Amino acid sequence: STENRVIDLVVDENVPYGLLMQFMDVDDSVYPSTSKPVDLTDFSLRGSIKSSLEDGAETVASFTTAIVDAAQGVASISLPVSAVTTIASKASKERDRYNPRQRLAGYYDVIITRTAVGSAASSFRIMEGKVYISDGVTQ
Amino acid sequence: MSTENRVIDLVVDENVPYGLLMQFMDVDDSVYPSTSKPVDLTDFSLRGSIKSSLEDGAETVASFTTAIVDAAQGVASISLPVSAVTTIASKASKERDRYNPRQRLAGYYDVIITRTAVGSAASSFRIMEGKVYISDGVTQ
Amino acid sequence: MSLQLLRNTRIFVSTVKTGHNKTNTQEILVQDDISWGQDSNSTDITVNEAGPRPTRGSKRFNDSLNAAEWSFSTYILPYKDKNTSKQIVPDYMLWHALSSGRAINLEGTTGAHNNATNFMVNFKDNSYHELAMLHIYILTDKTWSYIDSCQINQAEVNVDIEDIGRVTWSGNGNQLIPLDEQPFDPDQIGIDDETYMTIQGSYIKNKLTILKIKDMDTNKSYDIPITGGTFTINNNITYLTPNVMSRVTIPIGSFTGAFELTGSLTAYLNDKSLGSMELYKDLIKTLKVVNRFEIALVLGGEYDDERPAAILVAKQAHVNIPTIETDDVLGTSVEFKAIPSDLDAGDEGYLGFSSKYTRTTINNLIVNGDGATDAVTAITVKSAGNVTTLNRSATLQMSVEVTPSSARNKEVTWAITAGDAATINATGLLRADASKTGAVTVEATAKDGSGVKGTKVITVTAGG
Amino acid sequence: MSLQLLRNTRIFVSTVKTGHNKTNTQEILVQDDISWGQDSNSTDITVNEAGPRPTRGSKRFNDSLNAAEWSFSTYILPYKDKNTSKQIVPDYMLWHALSSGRAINLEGTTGAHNNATNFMVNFKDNSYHELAMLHIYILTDKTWSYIDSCQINQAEVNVDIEDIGRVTWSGNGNQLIPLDEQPFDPDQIGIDDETYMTIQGSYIKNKLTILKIKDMDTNKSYDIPITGGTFTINNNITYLTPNVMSRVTIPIGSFTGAFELTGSLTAYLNDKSLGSMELYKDLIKTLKVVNRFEIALVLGGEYDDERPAA
Amino acid sequence: MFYSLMRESKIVIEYDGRGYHFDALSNYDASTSFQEFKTLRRTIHNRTNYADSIINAQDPSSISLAINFSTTLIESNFFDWMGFTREGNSLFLPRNTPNIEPIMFNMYIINHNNSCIYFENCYVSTVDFSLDKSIPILNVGIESGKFSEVSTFRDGYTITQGEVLPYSAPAVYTNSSPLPALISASMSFQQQCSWREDRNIFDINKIYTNKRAYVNEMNASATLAFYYVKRLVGDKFLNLDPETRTPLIIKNKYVSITFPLARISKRLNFSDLYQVEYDVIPTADSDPVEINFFGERK
Amino acid sequence: AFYYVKRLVGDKFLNLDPETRTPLIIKNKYVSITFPLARISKRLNFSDLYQVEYDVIPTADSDPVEINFFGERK
Amino acid sequence: MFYSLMRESKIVIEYDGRGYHFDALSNYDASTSFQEFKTLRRTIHNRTNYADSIINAQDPSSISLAINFSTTLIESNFFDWMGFTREGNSLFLPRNTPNIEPIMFNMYIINHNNSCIYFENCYVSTVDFSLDKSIPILNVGIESGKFSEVSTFRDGYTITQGEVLPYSAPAVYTNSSPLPALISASMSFQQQCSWREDRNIFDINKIYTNKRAYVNEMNASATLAFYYVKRLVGDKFLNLDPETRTPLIIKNKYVSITFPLARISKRLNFSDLYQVEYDVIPTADSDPVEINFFGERK
């Protein structure tokens, strides 16, 4: 368990990217952990892809948040193929050790937010990590 | 007979407000089992400050905002707004650590709970201590 | 039909196996003691019987090849190149592959990086299982050959007085490969006469060797005239070779060991103040498990006018308990090791090479880490409005003046040392109260670690 | 502000750390090969990882100090002193601390004890875990120092013909301590010119070396002219040092090992009666597990008129 | 980040609310572990490959310390905590075990940067030292019930071990007659306790830690090694016959273990030089075994 | 087998507590063994430099354990 | 006083009233010990700490001798005493064990100054020697019942072992066809007796010593090590198949152990050079196993 916010995204060159997050609320009080999904009301997600963590870093791209099926908790984060091309343009020429197709493009993090659901701006970061562009061959 | 854990290291998130709440509970070990009643925080105030070093003359990075949430349940919350988080992020050490470039050392913090009144004794008490770290964020 | 002589060998250091240009390959001026090769392992299988008419026969199998060994010695020859006007040592990529495992970038701040003032090498970025990868190219007379995928194992520097400053390189390679065709024209890549004149203008003589040692736990600088010494930069690199019974194998990859920066310094015993005898007696009287010494070995000497020099700086060093070397003149040995503040912090030490070191340049290299960044030399603290005293319940926000006027770190800290009649804050706003009838002091020190002192005795009285 | 030369070293042997007089301390005439010191042990703790971006850093700890080593060579110089009129060797307390673990008593009959005829050393009273305890005092030019609680580990004697009779001492001490103040006036304790003349009157030349060997199982004395040899008196003393992880430690006490008195004697083969060839042939013909020989190596030769000898 | 070096550590034992920092520590060894219940439910329906493992208990820790003798004699508290009665500076082995449960104490293993490992519910289960021709050292062995990681701790600034005692040759006597040709005198003392596992169904879905224990027995023992030496033909004093009761004392300049009456068994080894080996235990009706601790000048 | 390393005082990520389910992967340039959900037990040794030792087995309901074989260039 | 050196010793075996001083002894090992009955009577009244130990028996001694072959062949008496029947200089393994109890003899281990250790009621329980490329030596193993210390003894001035036999390479045959590529031929012979403990209530308050024993079995065995060698493809003579009955002889210039019919089991090891290992035992109906002792010139 503990914390696992750090996960790295590998986006594909020349292909639009879309991620599907099934938000969930597991509780291990009872031995079969409760599968209750969180209910997505007054929730907005924001995420930017910025090269390096230093202050003043240029914004490589910005995630486009989608909220669908609020009852069952799922949500989608995506960005158009034009955003993918803009990301791939500024990616470094050095390739990842384990995969000779990935190149480090920047860092990211998405931040959930409650906007005055109880007169509170309860915004906290969901996940984080590095964004990797995977060089394509089709185009 | 056991040990306390006054030394606690906090990790804040850049561009996000940080909220920590402490509950003070009275305890006792007797013939009947452990009886716990919340401590009534009346005339109880908190105050915390952050400096970049322990040595005298250290630059004050920021200070924490203190509040009491529920006296009957003995809950007090110690936190700082997002602007203070940005202020501490600016003043943090620039030295990164591999395997996790996010975290940077920000300084040392202390929290004193005090009860000041004419009939009350001038008693302070350092409830905690430790170091403050920052998880750098890219959004905002 | 020709014999090949060792005197006609020429060594080129490369980071690429193709596209050789002046930024990837340069000649390395080597000496007589150059050596290279590759050994092979074998095995004998013998039948060991006990009866009469036993079988007496053996059989040999080639089973593996060892890692290629190479070594050579070069002179420490700092100079400034005409193209970039930045001080650089000719065998700079050797220093880089010794220092860090990243791509070479002289414009950066880690590994081998140069400047308009001096050439610097720090080990702050050597946390890699495979450091920067070189390819030694060997040219003997007409035939070519090279060692594939070399790594700088160590660099021996022997402080041998009445001799020139020299460094000995050692390392290992995957395989020694003989080349039939010329990889690159050695006439163009090899150093020309102009840069040869520029280099020979600058030589480092081991005789003119001053040493700067200071006990960080006591603030005691010693005056130790050296007799002879040596320091090493060691990587403890081990080459891995696979074991295959059917075919011979060559090493496939390597792994760097523990980075060690040790040394050994011999000197005569001196009865003078802060001499060798005092250091030896202090070290054998304290008997401490850990020591914090600052060692700055300055090859080539320090002078007001410009002189060549090579400097090794160990900020937090560890000094062994010295021993007395009974010779015709009594002496001692100061064996030290540069340890880091934290294991994964690097920064065990650094080096600075240049043909232009004024004393101030080496001083600010030692205390700031770079020869270009100026460092504070002296301080006299100033009050608010040229005030000489203070009375009870009065503030005194004191200021500071520093020299030189171009020091990078112009800030100071504040403290009270002698007497208890006032208190000072971070900014310097000294505050007092009543019942203060004693003489109190105030102090200030810079944040760059120069060791500059700012003192003032304010005569605080009870008032009129 | 001065440099110290080895030629100006003076060595005094003491049994007491205070109250130094002429019966507790005397100078020992040493040679060029004198040496002393103390080594220290350490350790490097290195992290040995396997992943990429591994930690490459070490750390050193001083953990212990070794026992102090000292050695020097002296000439065998028997003579008679004017005060007691008994033959005595100047480095007699060295012989005593080598021979026995009791307090020195030249009037006795064990260890180093003298007489009106000769100075004698026997090992009949060396059954001790800690032999007689000395303190070597070293004076180099102006600065003083000494080794605390020394013990005579061994005494090498090399029978090197065409050379003077000499003995080499070796030993260990608990700790080498540098002294800032003078313990005792070296002018008074040091040997004066009169005893120097008396000593230099008597020298032992290794060339004039007769050897007396006899097989006790056969009663056969041999005539063996020596070519070169050596004999040792060894104590096999080992110094114990405690192991403490938090603080460096110096040796605390010692324990004597097995007392060995060995030798080696080289000579040419002689075909004459009772020569080297006869001894060699008898020894290789008997092939016995144990031998009983009487050996009396006489340095300095035997003569009707008075001559020095060891 | 922060690595943890054994040489850069400090072991503090917490008893009665006071910290006994045991300096002069040559070497210590410890380990922590957990107990699992791993069952594989292979059925005719599904012959599975994935086990059902849950961590439910903390395996008791076995900490061993090697402590040099010191001039302040803090190390005798290990005999004191292990059950021996105290009079002055001498420790008695009581005729009967005083209490059912041992004396429990906590122990810290401090390290830099507020790092610590907190062993709780410890008891001294073994203490043995060999009087030999090397510097004596007593290896103590304690068993813990619960281990934990804590931020702040107890550090024994004042209560600490002094300088190590200088070496002194051992000697074993019978009354006042010395026993010749000693080789190595090894003494052993134990408090063979046993954990009382009380893991019940109320601890399901929780991590269980041992808390209570009872003393099975205490004992004092010594193994003496000699060289087979005889002074007479048909000697009576030195032989191989067993000795039902004989007063023995293994004496040193700083410690003296006394057996008022001892049961000695002898064992001869025909080695390079013949060696006899004793097995000394106190008799049934023997007076309490003495262990004196002399700092300096007896 | 690891070295006992902690980055914070009272750290939550790196400690000695058991982990009932956690995704683990032992990755190389040519092979990668994947445990979609793992049961980790920790063991600390107070050696010259403190070492922690894991005991990784897949959980009851974990997805099949992966073993990838990359020849060259993944 | 008098120390006891192993090198300064003399081992004399007393049989039939004659002393067999076994010279040419490379090395021997022996030990003596006693058996104790140590019980701890912890009661609810007094949870005592002092045991009730009484020495009541002598643990049987296990003496092992390593004896070089000699020209006078005194060492064959160990086969003679262990139960083999004698005809001339050849020792037969009888089809049935002759007697229930083994052949008992006493043994002395003499030393200087009238010092001695007297082992009584001994029997030869093991004899094995390896014919190899080193000098052969047979390690005998005898077990004693009672050990004692005596002043005067028996010393075999006349009956003694002569000069050691010169080395000669071993060779193993099948009938007269040599077996190629021999490495090490090890032979083993045993008389696996067992002590009959008859400690009864009439021996209370007394030290008991074992006196009588019975033979469980005798056997002759040999382990042969070869190199895996084949001369033909699909060879019949040299292979890995078991051999129910085949005449074997492990021959030397001075000794020849003969198996008139042998049961051979083979074992192949894929080592640096392939090695096969035999396990030779005589068959059910095989004729008695021969052991010839040739001094000189056969």
PDB file of N, CA and C in Angstrom, chain D residues 206-228:
ATOM      1  N   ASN D 206      84.603 -11.047  16.263  1.00  0.00           N
ATOM      2  CA  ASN D 206      83.950 -12.287  15.868  1.00  0.00           C
ATOM      3  C   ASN D 206      84.876 -13.232  15.121  1.00  0.00           C
ATOM      4  N   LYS D 207      85.967 -12.723  14.543  1.00  0.00           N
ATOM      5  CA  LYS D 207      86.894 -13.601  13.835  1.00  0.00           C
ATOM      6  C   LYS D 207      87.470 -14.666  14.754  1.00  0.00           C
ATOM      7  N   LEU D 208      88.003 -14.265  15.908  1.00  0.00           N
ATOM      8  CA  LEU D 208      88.615 -15.198  16.853  1.00  0.00           C
ATOM      9  C   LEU D 208      87.509 -15.973  17.568  1.00  0.00           C
ATOM     10  N   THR D 209      86.867 -16.875  16.832  1.00  0.00           N
ATOM     11  CA  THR D 209      85.723 -17.620  17.354  1.00  0.00           C
ATOM     12  C   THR D 209      86.031 -19.111  17.318  1.00  0.00           C
ATOM     13  N   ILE D 210      86.227 -19.702  18.491  1.00  0.00           N
ATOM     14  CA  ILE D 210      86.375 -21.145  18.634  1.00  0.00           C
ATOM     15  C   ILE D 210      85.036 -21.724  19.064  1.00  0.00           C
ATOM     16  N   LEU D 211      84.728 -22.923  18.581  1.00  0.00           N
ATOM     17  CA  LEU D 211      83.491 -23.609  18.931  1.00  0.00           C
ATOM     18  C   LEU D 211      83.817 -24.968  19.530  1.00  0.00           C
ATOM     19  N   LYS D 212      83.082 -25.331  20.576  1.00  0.00           N
ATOM     20  CA  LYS D 212      83.287 -26.580  21.305  1.00  0.00           C
ATOM     21  C   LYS D 212      81.985 -27.370  21.257  1.00  0.00           C
ATOM     22  N   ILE D 213      81.955 -28.417  20.437  1.00  0.00           N
ATOM     23  CA  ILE D 213      80.784 -29.267  20.269  1.00  0.00           C
ATOM     24  C   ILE D 213      81.159 -30.689  20.664  1.00  0.00           C
ATOM     25  N   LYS D 214      80.280 -31.343  21.419  1.00  0.00           N
ATOM     26  CA  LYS D 214      80.530 -32.693  21.907  1.00  0.00           C
ATOM     27  C   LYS D 214      79.234 -33.489  21.894  1.00  0.00           C
ATOM     28  N   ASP D 215      79.288 -34.701  21.347  1.00  0.00           N
ATOM     29  CA  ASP D 215      78.134 -35.590  21.346  1.00  0.00           C
ATOM     30  C   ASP D 215      78.051 -36.305  22.689  1.00  0.00           C
ATOM     31  N   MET D 216      77.039 -35.955  23.487  1.00  0.00           N
ATOM     32  CA  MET D 216      76.892 -36.540  24.813  1.00  0.00           C
ATOM     33  C   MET D 216      76.530 -38.018  24.774  1.00  0.00           C
ATOM     34  N   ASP D 217      76.003 -38.512  23.655  1.00  0.00           N
ATOM     35  CA  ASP D 217      75.660 -39.924  23.531  1.00  0.00           C
ATOM     36  C   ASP D 217      76.845 -40.792  23.137  1.00  0.00           C
ATOM     37  N   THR D 218      77.944 -40.189  22.682  1.00  0.00           N
ATOM     38  CA  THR D 218      79.102 -40.938  22.216  1.00  0.00           C
ATOM     39  C   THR D 218      80.417 -40.434  22.798  1.00  0.00           C
ATOM     40  N   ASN D 219      80.433 -39.264  23.437  1.00  0.00           N
ATOM     41  CA  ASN D 219      81.647 -38.664  23.993  1.00  0.00           C
ATOM     42  C   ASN D 219      82.681 -38.421  22.891  1.00  0.00           C
ATOM     43  N   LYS D 220      82.287 -37.603  21.919  1.00  0.00           N
ATOM     44  CA  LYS D 220      83.113 -37.299  20.757  1.00  0.00           C
ATOM     45  C   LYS D 220      83.149 -35.790  20.561  1.00  0.00           C
ATOM     46  N   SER D 221      84.273 -35.168  20.903  1.00  0.00           N
ATOM     47  CA  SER D 221      84.466 -33.746  20.671  1.00  0.00           C
ATOM     48  C   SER D 221      84.995 -33.517  19.262  1.00  0.00           C
ATOM     49  N   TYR D 222      84.422 -32.534  18.578  1.00  0.00           N
ATOM     50  CA  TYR D 222      84.763 -32.236  17.197  1.00  0.00           C
ATOM     51  C   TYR D 222      85.524 -30.917  17.110  1.00  0.00           C
ATOM     52  N   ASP D 223      86.358 -30.804  16.083  1.00  0.00           N
ATOM     53  CA  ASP D 223      87.159 -29.608  15.829  1.00  0.00           C
ATOM     54  C   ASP D 223      86.607 -28.934  14.577  1.00  0.00           C
ATOM     55  N   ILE D 224      85.686 -27.995  14.767  1.00  0.00           N
ATOM     56  CA  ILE D 224      84.991 -27.356  13.655  1.00  0.00           C
ATOM     57  C   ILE D 224      85.367 -25.881  13.583  1.00  0.00           C
ATOM     58  N   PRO D 225      86.228 -25.474  12.647  1.00  0.00           N
ATOM     59  CA  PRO D 225      86.500 -24.040  12.455  1.00  0.00           C
ATOM     60  C   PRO D 225      85.323 -23.375  11.754  1.00  0.00           C
ATOM     61  N   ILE D 226      84.738 -22.382  12.413  1.00  0.00           N
ATOM     62  CA  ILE D 226      83.495 -21.772  11.952  1.00  0.00           C
ATOM     63  C   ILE D 226      83.769 -20.845  10.776  1.00  0.00           C
ATOM     64  N   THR D 227      82.764 -20.681   9.919  1.00  0.00           N
ATOM     65  CA  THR D 227      82.796 -19.717   8.831  1.00  0.00           C
ATOM     66  C   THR D 227      81.859 -18.540   9.058  1.00  0.00           C
ATOM     67  N   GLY D 228      80.753 -18.759   9.763  1.00  0.00           N
ATOM     68  CA  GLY D 228      79.791 -17.718  10.057  1.00  0.00           C
ATOM     69  C   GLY D 228      78.576 -18.315  10.733  1.00  0.00           C
TER      70      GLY D 228
END
